Structures are given as C-alpha cells and as structure tokens.
Amino acid sequence: TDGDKAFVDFLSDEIKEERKIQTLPKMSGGWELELNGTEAKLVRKVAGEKITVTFNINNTPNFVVEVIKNDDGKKALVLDCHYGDIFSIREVSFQSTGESEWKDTNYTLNTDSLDWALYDHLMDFLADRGVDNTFADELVELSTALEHQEYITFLEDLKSFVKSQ
Amino acid sequence: TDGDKAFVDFLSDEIKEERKIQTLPKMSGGWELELNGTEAKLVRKVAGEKITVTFNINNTPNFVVEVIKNDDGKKALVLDCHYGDIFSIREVSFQSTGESEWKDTNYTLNTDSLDWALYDHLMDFLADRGVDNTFADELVELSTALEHQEYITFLEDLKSFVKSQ
Amino acid sequence: TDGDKAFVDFLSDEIKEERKIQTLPKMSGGWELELNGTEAKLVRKVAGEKITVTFNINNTPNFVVEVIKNDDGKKALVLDCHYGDIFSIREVSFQSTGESEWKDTNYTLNTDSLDWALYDHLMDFLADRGVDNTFADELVELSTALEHQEYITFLEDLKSFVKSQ
Which residues carry the post-translational modification N6-acetyllysine, per the record (chains A, B, C)? Predict the structure, then answer.
C-alpha cells in the first residue's frame, strides 16, 4: 500500500528524532529496579520488612506501596499514592500478597476527608520507609524517562508491524 | 522506630474513642444477614423466589438485588440500585447465578432516560419483594454501622501490624 | 401478585409497540457479522491480514479494531475508537490475540494530545483497511438496530421471567 510504506518512512523519522532527544535516573535509598514493560517495581528489604513501590507508566498518575512484615508474609499493608502534582495517600488496605486481585471485601481506608492526624501519621510511616517527597520527586523523572523509552520501543514495534509483508 | 511506636500509641487512642462512640440494626421483613468482611448479603426466600440484596461498605453507594425463580436457577434478574440520596434503579439485566463476572454480552437496561411507566413497574416489582423505600432507609443505617465496625477492625489490624517486631 | 400480572400485561403492550416500530443494515466492504448477544464482530480477511471490528451495544460508544498480520499471529495491533459523535482513535497498543485481558504492561498510545501527523497516519492506516468515516457512519445504524433488537429480546425475557409461576 502507498499509505503503509509512507507511514513506515514517517515512523523512521520519528524514531530518529526521539532517540536524538535522548537515560533512566536512579532512586536514592538503595532501591532495586525491576522493569516489566510499562510496569516498574522498586524494592527494598530493610529491617524485617520488604517495601515494594509499583507504578505503571501507561497511566492521574499513581503508585502503590506494599509493606510486608517478613514475620507474616500473607498480609501486606497497601498504600495507593498520587504523585506528580502532589504526593499524598489515596487509599490504604491490607491485601494478601501475590493475589491476582484486590480482595474487594477487605476494608479500604479512603483518605478523602481523613482526619489530618491519622493522615500525617500515615505520611510519616511512609517517610520512615524511604517513601518521602524526595522519593516522589525522583519517581516523576524515572517515570518520565521510562515512558519515553517505552514509547520509542512502541514506534519501533509499530514500524516493524506496518513494514512486515 | 520512634515514629512507629508513636503511631501505635495514637492508634490505641483512636480505637478507644471509636468504640466509646459505639450495634448493627435489624432489617424489617425477615431478612437474614451474611457478613463477608465489607460485603453484606441480605437473604429472603418467599414464594418460589430467592431474593438477595448485596452491598459493599467500601463504596455513590449502591446495592444489587438478585431475584432467582427457584424453577430455573441458572438465570437471575439483577437490579443495580442507588441508596442514601435517593433510592432508584440504575441498571437491570439477566445474569447467570454464581458467575465470577457479569456477562458483558447480556443486555443491560440502563435506566438513564427510561420511560417513567417501565421504571415505576420495576420499582413496584422490587417493592413487592420487600425492597421499598423503608428497606432502603433501613439499609443506610445498617451500612453505616457496618462501616464503623470494619473501620474499627482496620485500626486494630493497623495497630497490630505497626506494633509487630 | 397483583403487580406481577399487571407488569406482564404492560410488558406485552411494550413488546407489540416496539416490534411495530420495527432490520439490521449491512456494512459496505465485504464484512461478515458475528453476533454474541450484545457484542458484535465484523470480520475481513484481505491481504495477509485479518481485520476485526468489535463493539458492544450496552455502552461514550466505542469500537475496537484488531489487525492481525497472518505471518505472526501472536501480536495484534489494537485501536480503540470512538463513534457516533466523531470517529477518532482513543488508544493504540499491541496485544496478544485471544487473551482473557489487555496486558496492562504493554505500552498504550493514548491519543489525547497526540501529534496531528502521527494521528493522521493512524487514521489513514485504518482507512486503508476499510475503517473510514463511511464505515463509522454505517456502524452507528447497525449498532442502533442491534440495540433495539436486544432490548426487545430483553422485554420478552423479562415478561417470561415475571410470568413464570
């Protein structure tokens, strides 16, 4: 098709321009990064605790913190958080680790009009585990670089797709 | 951690205050209550019919009515309803009982601009089965008490979690 | 019940009125139609390509285009599209064919502020495969007729349900 091979030439140009524009920055705090396509996991084991921060660059942007007390590995404290605009906690609950789905029947603390004092203690709980406003600022730029890399990979996949046959 | 044990002391105070503030009221109509964490089920078997009202106190608040004609147990009439502000029916469809998921391919009657006459007959159909505005008012206070009990249980779980180690 | 048999008589009247008001139009372009209740699939195999347009009349209205290059059947280009108001592409990604779920970890091109030039090439890519504004206009009337047929079937199912016993 005329359109297809022109679309391929155009995608070639876009890939050059976006690579030229340019890598992944680091997170302070001894985190280890695990990439699964658009999903990133930052991991820290400290003092009988595993802390996992999970975000997906496809999506208001959010990240999920999972705190596992290694004494009792079946139930994790899960804190859904906003980042970018403001940091802030949106929801807290206990979940089974490694489930295919949030148990809808476990209680979820929505923070919408939450007592400022309980809210601040929750923020301090996160800060003590490394998830502070510095972490949230560093996450923005990691997320931003990761989105650009995956977008470039997508243009390549699209170019390869359209050029096949 | 300094913060952790202070967070525990604060949660201790909150648990006392919320229990002090204070149980589950009853539903008129011979309903039986089954609690699964934040999900409640109210059940009635009357005249060849099983009526199940399901709501989850995590979440505009809604409840689902499931009518099963005991002659043909495979397909249930499902009425998604709003409660609190106004009663009102939001959606009606037939679903297989005991499915893991709403069959997306079964027709769903959205009530958004629904003929008032069909709407009123649907309201009368529910009222005949006990789901009236009295039921919906009683549900608000049952839901409200159930949310408070589960929130108290959550503070205890949080306090226990943070205090461990 | 008094209400039930009156509801049955009323549903009888509604079914007559809606059938009286009146079938499924055709899609230009050699498409084959497969109905699964409220989900419709339009299918075309052309030049080493399978094109599938899927929409569900329950639901802003949208349809999904799936392009499979028969050389490599494991990954399909998926274009989520709006129809009715404007045509337009909302999201593009690669997905495994025949999955139970969108892989959340595959990159999704949201078109929200997308470069007009990449957007137009995507529109041309669809148009070359038959998904043009003519197709989208024809789809509106197919969807509209299909919703009416399924609604009539729903009134019959409701009438049959309420009349049983």
Answer: 16
